[PDB]
Design a protein around this ligand. Structure first.
Ligand SMILES: CCCCCCCC/C=C/CCCCCCCC(=O)OC[C@H](COP(=O)(O)OCCN)OC(=O)CCCCCCCCCCCCCCC
Ligand SMILES: CCCCCCCCCCCCCCCCCC(=O)O[C@@H](COC(=O)CCCCCCCCCCCCCCC)COP(=O)(O)OCCN
Ligand SMILES: [Mg+2]
Lengths: 29, 674, 190, 557
């Protein structure tokens, strides 16, 4: 629970959100 | 793919690297993110800010940059020319000039003001040949405008300064004689500008197979992202954690890149097959969509018919012989250089061997079309031969103290009912008869439309032509439906209608009025004889100009779908088998005893992940050759074809990752690199 | 949507039917038909309860048949804190426990075999296990016979009188009821 | 010993199909909205009184009905546990549960998980056990069977818009299926030794001079419906290895049969509602292959047992560290596999003392999604999500359009199927990661080395998949673990129920087409193999890293 770990956690969550949004909006992506 | 096409694809790949343009590709966007992260990691390790070997993350980053740039390049070949371009329409709109007038009765102060700079209420002058600068109305002078960009037809239409024929259109050419115009639309919204905005702005959907493959891509990449991400906590608990460079590299080497490259591989294979078929496809999805087409909207003038309405049959006027009428027609249209008068001459020559009446220079005044009297002709010797519409000659006869027989009008009505424009002929004050300018269908088309109906493809025929001739040609060709007198808005709205039912539409057009519709269709084949506007909108150009080449385009679309299925099996087998080959190396650092899981006896985690990225790059490069070489295009039922694909391509896609990664790793070790 | 009138009525009706009627009906039938198994299968010595025929107690005397280890919370064989020693196979604490138990069992039964049954050494799942296979119970016959001054044949047929084979030979194990076995042993030595 | 393991598996499956077949033909009437033979006038009177008009419901109304029943049950059970010191049937005046423990128990029971972080002997009082826990056992089982009723109707109905009435579905299911069967099972358990009484705890004085205090609740009814509705909530701490819950080998056999009775009968019923028995048989074959292989693996791993035992001084190395001497090692192995394949949760052995592979395989079965004879109703629509995914990838792999049971499948169904499949492994991995990065979470563990991580992983994978089983060494009775597992259970259950109802909604407004070239048969061994492959590969791609650092790391050294 430091700068690096929090950066990694939030980046993984951003990528999950991006991929889920792409999946829900396959048509555009 | 001429030299220049490859260089443009390379420039557009370099220019698509920017994240804002890469965001629309999930797998390649994650490879882009990981590539950037490893570039930063290598720059850090080289700056000393992070302990470790900078040159290994440098190798990983270089290879991920190669992967992303070749994916961009393959998708710039197979799809960068896909969207419709309104370049010729924009050119006509930008290189137009208007003779602004002062004292607009007639005036003589022609100011060569660019037509774009005209506003409503301003008066303009157009003369023979000069394109109509902008939309508007006529207020003096009568001429024959070439309104071919609105209907698709080629017959000159008379605009005559007061009545119902008084609204010229911007872009259409004027042919007969002078004409002064009163603009009626600010340059923002003309007709030309309206259809420019309608062409660029109509997007083509994605094939449902492509959407399904994208969903599978995103599911697999979510699975791999979860696995690789949560690998850190777990490993950290188990003593020695997994270095962050190994984590990002494992993520961006586990994601299914093969599947990501499958789209552009099948695209470039499809365009190669099309060139083979004598069709210039600019879009890779167009071929697979051609495989999936259910409807076929067709144009009529130029697409189905020759597009110039040759002469068919001289018709007597109840007393004159056909020889006399043929001589009169061949003399009137002797000077006419449009294909219609030329065809009148040709037909008269063959049917009545009138060679005697061909003279380069005989004393004979030539009387061209005027649009005031509305009839062409000649005066050879003590004769006044004229030819033109039925009403024009009616006026001429009634004004010359003659009489207009009624059976001539009966024949005129008949020739109109047969799908042909009748040209009445006169010599003095006695109508000689009618010339049936009929539209010639291109060739043997009923057979091919029957074949298209047998393939399960509806066949509509929308034109901008009369209902009479539209119905005549729909019967004489065998199309299912037909919608006559259709504006470009109508064709585009009909394509939107059809493809809003979930089906895939495929229009075949050759004119500017087809540019909207062709721009929106899924498989828009533009006739190579068509205009540049129609050829810039359509997905593909037909070098044979045959309007039934959708049959062959559909055979090749179905072959590309068999190839897409074979290589989809290969791709899924490949990414999965590569996952098993790649991950055992990642545990060796955490627990010693988990080297037993390293079946392939790879050297280290570093050398396994470097081999993984090299392999992902090479396999994405070699998917294209594999797609170019076809498959056994045999008719096999779903179960038997699934079994064949599984056996051959799935087993190939399992053995390929293990052998490929191990041989790349063996090369890295023997060479000394890792 | 979930209308409140049928959603509330459905929930309340199912609440009453499957919370009062079903338990009440099972309790009525259970007590009426099976009044001994339903009230815990208790053993009695006239007035004082001496345990269930199902639970199994911590026997430590030298003249009794000892069951498995317990691993319950406070004292071994504690019905109020049932549970097993959830010790993995890789936990060295489990090896310490097994070694201690094997040493104790080889010290208590000197004239039996040296290979201790794997049951007497390992702790049951619930902690309240009244059962040991007749092999484990017949590994203790020398010690219990010397302590009780009985003959090995008497204890053999006694253990046999309290073994319980399953219906078919592969859905369970033959097992010795230890509580009842030791109570019968006491009633014998009297 | 291999002959006996084989005989055990064979007799289990044989009796299982003998029972399930008729019950599945009986459930095919409820799916078809036909009143069972005798119950058609009492239905009129009842449904009229209960306010239930038998008006059909679209997928939104149906889903909202199920979620509303579940939220109402959650609120009622939470407040019942929280304030159980006022309510009757409390011989030992036990206090009300904590806010975290009350919340976790409510969420677990409402979601058919029945995860237990407490000790039922010294935590709950007969009222809570009887009036809350087992009422919710019936209601969660009926909610899951009702969701699969709606999905089957969506598959079999042509160009319709309504999936039937949900209130009638729940009332029918409970009153006419769960209740009579549970009553027969309960009275058999009472015959064999299980408890049924509301007496105070019985004060035993041992044969020696010791002391004991036996717990004396109403065990048999809650036991019958915990097994029959694949709930798994045990009355006592040792879930069903307690002599008062599973008194003999016979009741244990009947308990495994009950655990698998309704999932197998739903597969037979699904076969019979499509007029094509081969569909149900295909699902049963796909499930049975995996089940048999897993049972064999666990039996072998447990008969090999603890290596150190033989060296420490014993006669066998058979792993008996967490197993009752009443059921052998083979029966404990079979029950472990059954309970974790069936999304039940009941254990007759401590799964933490299982060997490395013997704990890998049950955990692995929980993590692939519990589609192998899965939970009541939940298992079948999970396997239907995987069947839709298999048909999708088959269509993708041949180039033609997907199609299952004559109805073409859009891309909306693919999006919903992918999200539904992914929601559970996301919960498992993310929850396990969060638990291993916080001191509150990894400190709960009991065993050291990779087995501690196996405990954390098994707990979060069990909660996320609504199983209920636990390695049970994990001290998961803190606010952190309670709230974490409550979130996992809730989201797993209902974020899988929601996309399934959306998929029923889309599918029920379609029409079954005719055969064509893009219609691969969904029966026969080709599609059985394709479906097994899909299931196992999703599970493996997701959890092979996690499993490699727990059970396999422990196995290898
Ligand atoms: C290295 C580690 C492993 C990595 C694995 C990844 C590989 C996936 C692709 C490779 C498969 C190659 C194996 C070759 C299999 C050859 C099949 C055959 O020949 O079929 C013979 C008969 C026909 O039965 P029938 O009487 O005709 O049926 C009458 C009609 N109903 O049965 C059979 O065995 C059929 C067996 C079916 C096996 C197909 C399993 C593929 C699953 C793909 C799912 C991927 C999804 C990704 C997850 C997100
Ligand atoms: C409450 C939601 C109900 C709807 C259905 C619920 C479905 C499951 C959701 C459960 C997740 C609940 C998270 C709640 C966090 C609450 C923390 C808190 O309330 O602080 C307490 C006092 O402070 C503490 O001691 C908290 C101790 C730490 C809490 C640790 C929670 C850590 C979160 C677990 C991690 C994962 C959370 C889920 C995300 C994965 C005070 O609570 P209370 O007495 O007012 O009454 C609540 C009655 N429901
Ligand atoms: Mg045209």
């Amino acid at each position: 629970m430091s700068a690096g770990v929090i950066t990694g956690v939030l980046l993984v969550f951003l990528l999950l959100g991006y991929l889920v949004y792409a999946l829900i909006n396959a048509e555009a992506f | 793919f001429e030299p220049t096409l490859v260089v443009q694809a390379l420039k557009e790949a370099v220019k698509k690297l920017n994240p804002q343009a890469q965001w629309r590709n999930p797998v390649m966007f994650i490879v882009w993110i990981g590539s950037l992260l490893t570039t930063c990691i290598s720059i850090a390790m080289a700056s000393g800010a992070m302990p470790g070997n900078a040159l290994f993350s440098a190798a990983i980053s270089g290879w991920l940059w190669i992967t992303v740039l070749f994916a961009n390049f393959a998708e710039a070949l197979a799809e960068g020319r896909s969207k419709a371009q309104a370049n010729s329409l924009k050119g006509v709109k930008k290189t137009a000039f208007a003779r602004k007038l002062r004292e607009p009765k007639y005036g003589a102060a022609a100011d060569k003001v660019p037509a774009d700079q005209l506003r409503k209420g301003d008066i303009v002058l157009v003369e023979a040949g000069d394109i109509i600068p902008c939309d508007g109305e006529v207020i003096e002078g009568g001429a024959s405008v070439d309104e071919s960009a609105i209907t698709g037809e080629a017959a000159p239409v008379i605009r005559e300064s007061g009545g119902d024929f008084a609204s010229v259109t911007g872009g259409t050419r004027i042919l007969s004689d002078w004409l002064v115009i009163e603009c009626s639309v600010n340059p923002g919204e003309t007709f030309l500008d309206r259809m420019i905005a309608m062409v660029e702005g109509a997007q083509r959907r994605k094939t449902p197979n492509e959407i399904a493959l994208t969903i599978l891509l995103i599911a697999l990449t979510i699975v791999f992202l979860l696995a690789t991400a949560t690998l850190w906590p777990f490993s950290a608990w188990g003593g020695n954690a997994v270095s962050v460079t190994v984590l990002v590299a494992l993520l961006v080497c586990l994601i299914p890149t093969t599947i990501g490259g499958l789209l552009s591989a099948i695209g470039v294979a499809g365009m190669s097959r099309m060139l083979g078929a004598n069709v210039i496809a600019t879009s890779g999805r167009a071929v697979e969509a051609a495989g999936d087409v259910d409807v076929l909207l067709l144009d009529k003038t130029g697409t189905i018919t020759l597009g110039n309405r040759q002469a068919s049959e001289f018709i007597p006027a109840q007393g004159v012989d056909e020889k006399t009428l043929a001589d009169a027609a061949q003399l009137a249209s002797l000077a006419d250089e449009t294909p219609e008068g030329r065809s009148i001459v040709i037909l008269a020559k063959q049917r009545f061997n009138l060679r005697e009446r061909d003279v380069q220079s005989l004393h004979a005044t030539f009387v061209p079309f005027t649009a005031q009297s509305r009839m062409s002709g000649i005066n050879i010797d003590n004769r006044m031969i004229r030819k033109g519409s039925v009403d024009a000659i009616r006026r001429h006869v009634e004004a010359n103290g003659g009489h207009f027989p009624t059976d001539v009008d009966q024949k005129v009505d008949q020739v109109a009912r047969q799908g042909a424009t009748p040209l009445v002929v006169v010599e003095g004050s006695r109508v000689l008869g009618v010339i049936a300018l009929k539209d010639i269908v291109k060739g043997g088309i009923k057979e091919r439309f029957a074949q298209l109906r047998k393939m399960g493809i509806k066949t509509v025929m929308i034109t901008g032509d009369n209902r009479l001739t539209a119905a005549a040609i729909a019967a004489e060709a065998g199309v299912d439906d037909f919608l006559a007198e259709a504006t470009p808005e109508a064709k585009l709205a009909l394509i939107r209608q059809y493809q809003a039912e979930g089906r895939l539409v495929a229009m075949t057009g050759d004119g500017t009025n087809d540019a909207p519709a062709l721009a929106q269709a899924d498989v828009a084949v533009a006739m190579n004889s068509g205009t540049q506007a129609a050829k810039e909108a359509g997905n593909m150009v037909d070098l044979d100009s045959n309007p039934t080449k959708l049959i062959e385009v559909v055979h090749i679309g179905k072959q590309m779908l068999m190839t897409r299925g074979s290589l989809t099996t290969f791709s899924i087998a490949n990414d999965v088998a590569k996952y098993f080959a790649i991950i055992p190396a990642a545990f060796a650092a955490t627990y010693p005893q988990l080297n037993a899981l390293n079946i392939m006896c790879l050297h280290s985690p570093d050398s396994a992940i470097l081999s993984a990225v090299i392999f992902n790059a090479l396999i994405i490069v070699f998917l294209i050759p594999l797609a170019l070489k076809g498959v056994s295009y045999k008719p096999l039922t779903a179960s038997a074809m699934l079994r064949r694909n599984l056996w051959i391509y799935g087993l190939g896609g399992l053995l390929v990752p293990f052998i490929g990664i191990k041989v790349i790793d063996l090369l890295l070790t023997v060479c000394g690199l890792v | 949507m979930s209308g409140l009138r049928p959603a509330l009525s459905t929930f309340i009706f199912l609440l009453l039917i499957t919370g009062g009627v079903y338990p009440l009906l099972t309790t009525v039938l259970g007590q009426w038909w099976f009044p001994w198994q339903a009230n815990g299968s208790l053993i009695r010595e006239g007035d004082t309860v001496r345990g269930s025929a199902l639970i199994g107690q911590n026997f430590t005397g030298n003249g009794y048949f000892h069951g498995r280890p317990s691993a319950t919370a406070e004292m071994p064989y504690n019905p109020q804190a049932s549970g097993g020693s959830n010790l993995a196979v890789s936990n060295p604490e489990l090896d310490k426990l097994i070694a201690a138990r094997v040493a104790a069992l080889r010290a208590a039964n000197p004239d039996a075999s040296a290979s201790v049954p794997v049951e007497l050494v390992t702790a049951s799942a619930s902690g309240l296990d009244n059962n040991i296979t007749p092999q484990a119970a017949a590994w203790q016959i020398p010690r219990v016979a010397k302590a009780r001054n009985l003959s090995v044949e008497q204890l053999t047929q006694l253990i046999a009188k309290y073994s319980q084979q399953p219906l078919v030979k592969y859905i369970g194990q033959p097992v010795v009821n230890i509580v009842e076995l030791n109570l019968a042993l006491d009633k014998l030595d009297e | 010993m291999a002959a006996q393991g084989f005989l055990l598996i064979a007799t289990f499956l044989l009796v299982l199909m003998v029972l399930a077949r008729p019950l599945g033909s009986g459930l095919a009437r409820l799916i078809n909205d036909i009143p069972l033979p005798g119950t058609t006038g009492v239905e009129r009177v009842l449904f009229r009184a209960l306010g239930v008009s038998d008006r059909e419901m679209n997928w939104k109304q149906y889903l909202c009905a199920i979620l509303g029943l579940n939220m109402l049950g959650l609120a009622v059970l939470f407040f019942m546990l929280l304030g159980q010191h006022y309510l009757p049937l409390n011989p030992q005046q036990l206090p009300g549960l904590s806010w975290d423990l009350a919340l976790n128990t409510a969420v677990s029971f409402v979601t058919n998980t029945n995860w237990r972080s407490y000790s039922g002997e010294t935590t709950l009082s007969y009222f809570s056990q009887m009036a809350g826990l087992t009422v919710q056992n019936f209601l969660s089982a009926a909610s899951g069977i009702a969701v699969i009723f709606a999905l089957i109707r969506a598959f079999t109905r042509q160009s319709m818009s309504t999936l039937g009435n949900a209130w009638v579905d729940l009332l029918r299911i409970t009153l006419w299926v769960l209740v009579p069967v549970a009553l027969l099972i309960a009275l058999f358990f009472i015959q064999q030794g299980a408890l049924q009484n509301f007496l105070p705890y019985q004060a035993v004085n041992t044969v020696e001079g010791a002391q004991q205090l036996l717990p004396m609740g109403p065990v048999a009814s809650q036991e019958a419906i915990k097994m029959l509705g694949t709930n798994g909530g045990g009355f006592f701490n040792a879930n069903s290895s307690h002599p008062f819950e599973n008194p003999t080998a016979l009741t244990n056999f009947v308990q495994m049969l009950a655990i698998f009775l309704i999932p197998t009968a739903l597969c037979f019923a699904f076969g019979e509602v499509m007029g094509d028995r081969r569909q149900g048989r295909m699902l049963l074959w796909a499930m049975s292959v995996i089940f048999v292989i897993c049972v064999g693996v666990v039996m072998w791993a447990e008969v090999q047992g603890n290596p150190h035992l033989l060296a420490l001084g014993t006669d066998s190395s058979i792993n008996m560290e967490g197993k009752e001497s009443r059921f052998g090692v083979l029966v404990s192995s079979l029950f472990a596999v059954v309970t974790t394949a069936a999304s039940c949760g009941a254990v007759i052995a401590m799964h933490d003392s299982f060997t490395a592979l013997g704990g890998m395989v049950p955990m692995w079965l929980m993590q692939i999604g519990e589609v192998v004879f899965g939970g009541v109703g939940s298992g079948l629509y999970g396997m239907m999500l995987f069947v839709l995914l298999a048909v999708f990838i088959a269509g993708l792999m041949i180039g033609r359009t997907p199609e299952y049971l004559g109805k073409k499948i859009d891309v909306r169904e693919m999006k919903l199927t992918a999200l539904a499949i992914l929601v559970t492994p996301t919960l498992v991995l993310m929850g396990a990661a969060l638990a291993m990065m916080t001191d509150a979470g990894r400190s709960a563990m009991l065993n050291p080395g990779p087995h501690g991580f196996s405990e954390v992983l098994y707990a979060v994978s069990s909660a996320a998949n609504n199983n209920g089983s636990a390695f049970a060494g994990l001290s998961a009775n803190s606010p952190f673990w309670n709230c974490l597992l409550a979130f996992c259970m809730f989201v797993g259950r209902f974020g899988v129920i929601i996309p399934v109802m959306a998929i029923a909604g889309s599918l029920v407004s379609k029409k079954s087409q005719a055969a064509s070239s893009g219609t691969l048969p969904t029966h026969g061994p080709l599609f059985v193999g394709l479906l097994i492959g899909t299931v196992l590969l999703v599970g493996a791609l997701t959890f092979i890293p996690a499993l490699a650092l727990g059970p396999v790391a422990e196995y290898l050294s």
